Structure 1
Amino acid sequence: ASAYQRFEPRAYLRNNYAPPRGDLCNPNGVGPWALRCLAQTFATGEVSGRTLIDIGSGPTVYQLLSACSHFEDITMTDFLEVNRQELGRWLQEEPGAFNWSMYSQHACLIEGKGECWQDKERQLRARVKRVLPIDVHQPQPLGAGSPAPLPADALVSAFCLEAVSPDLASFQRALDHITTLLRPGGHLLLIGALEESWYLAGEARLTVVPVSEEEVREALVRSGYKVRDLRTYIMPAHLQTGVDDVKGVFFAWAQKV
């Protein structure tokens, strides 16, 4: 976790959300695939509620585009204040925010409700009430009296756990830790890197725990969920760029029972 002090948000984004991994024009891309998982899961209108919490938001919002139209109270979090910062920048259309419009549009495109994308970036910005600091290794990630509405009706996390835990055991605990935040019967949308062990972010060189679809599932069950849906996307050769060594990406729709 010490390494996370050299984390460069602008380089993280550059490494992962700007072409090639960021080109949403090719259907076979990982961008389209991920946004599609989210779209379809929420489209089933089974993941509803008043509040929602996004764990380890980092400096990204794509993970919330389809969600934002289902929960009025959205809470975004992250360790690094540097990330909580970059988030704010886009939340207040401040100077030099990252441009997510291409992602916004591909959410609207995929959702097919004919929504204009400026309208989606509006609904999101509006529904995100707070950007809180968080530590998944803590038995109570947020803190004691967090401004966050608990328990949340739903959880969303992307590439967090496997990137902050040094091994499967650390990973499982971290999972159980955030699971506490989820109301019983609420939903979890977990995205992540399969069999990855490192990834760059400017100066920083972060360790990752290579995990598998079975390890991730077995661990989801172990944490107390009833695995609703679990998909795997194999990273094509053209999306390997030495910013990391990821093999594929996983999507999980879990339900705390």
Structure 2
Amino acid sequence: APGQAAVASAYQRFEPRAYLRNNYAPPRGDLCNPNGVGPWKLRCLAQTFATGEVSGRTLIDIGSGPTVYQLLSACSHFEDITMTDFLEVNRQELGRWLQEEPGAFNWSMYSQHACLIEGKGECWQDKERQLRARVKRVLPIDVHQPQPLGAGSPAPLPADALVSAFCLEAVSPDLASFQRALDHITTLLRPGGHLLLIGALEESWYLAGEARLTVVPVSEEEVREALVRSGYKVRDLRTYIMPAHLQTGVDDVKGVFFAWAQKV
């Protein structure tokens, strides 16, 4: 309770535009360099889905924040998608892009790169069209509660698959809390279901405007073990080491991990 209400307090200052700018605009957001983290992440999301292994009807994105890139390759495999976030402002920022409102963040370069990578000959507008169509709702959530979505959420539970990028470690004061939060969201997944977990490796802080957030520094092994401890079978685990040119003043992240896990 103490460690959670403290994080919750820091997030009250979280500025979406500042977050988007620090991470999804160049240099980290430059998709032209094949060696950048942007191309690497999109590639690993596309290859995972191209296997045909991850499919079903409903999907939940845990801690969406103001981003949708994590769902570009996923959207053509799930007709009902639920996006979520703890903050009102992020859910509003998402709405601005989903409803094509004014001031929405421009994700077009990412959509185009996902199309380029997938190689199905799809134009980026159709991709965004399909994502917007399949995202049925944007709900509040708290991975710290035993029932993250709450009592009677509109979300079709359990889900056939889950996606979570940079949420758990960024809202957990320590490894133990990270483990619990993972246990918590795992209850939202159907047995045999899939979890695509993405996050920061050995990171301890990051900025988002006037907000300065703490992060729990986790390692690939710690993540692997935590996944096992939560009833998962790790189908794939990859690490991307942050090169010097992508190490800016916005945080102290050392690498990024990708975990494809199956609830057994």
Q: Deviation of residue 2 (structure 1)?
A: 1.1
Question: Does 2:196 correspond to 1:189?
Answer: yes
**CA offset at residue 128 of structure 1?**
0.2
The aligned residue for residue 83 of structure 2 is: 76
Q: How many Å separate the matches in 1 of 2:165 and 2:88? A: 18
Per-residue displacement from partner, 1:54-101 (whole Å, max 9, x unpaired)? 000000000000000000000000000100000000000000100000
Tell me the secondary structure at the aligned position of residue 30 of structure 2: coil
Report the identity percentage: 100
CA RMSD across the alignment: 0.3
Instruction: Show structure 1 runs of 5+ residues with no match.
Output: none
Alignment deviations for residues 188-244 of structure 1 (CA, whole Å, 9 cap, x no partner): 000000000000000000000000000000000000000000000000000011100
Q: Please give the secondary structure, in 1, of the residue aligned with 2:198.
A: strand
1:179: how far off? Answer: 0.0
| Structure 2 spans left out of the alignment, 5+ residues | 1-7
Residue in structure 2 matching 1:30, options 31, 37, 56 = 37
Q: How high is the TM-score relative to the length of structure 1?
A: 1.00
Alpha-carbon distance in 1 for matches of 2:53, 2:257:
20
2:141 and 2:51 map into 1 onto residues whose CA distance is: 30
Q: What TM-score comes out, normalization by structure 2 length?
A: 0.97
Q: Report runs of 4+ in structure 1 exceeding 2 Å deviation.
A: none
**Match in the other structure for 2:3:** none
What are the Cα deviations for residues 237-257 of structure 1, in whole angstroms up to 9, with x where unaligned?
A: 000111000000000000000
Q: Distance in 2 between matches of 1:121 and 1:106?
A: 12
SS at structure 2 position matched to 1:48? coil
Paired position in structure 2 for 1:97: 104
Distance in 2 between residues matched to 1:145 and 1:102, nearest whole Å? 37
Partner Cα separation in structure 2 for residue 30 and residue 250 of structure 1:
11
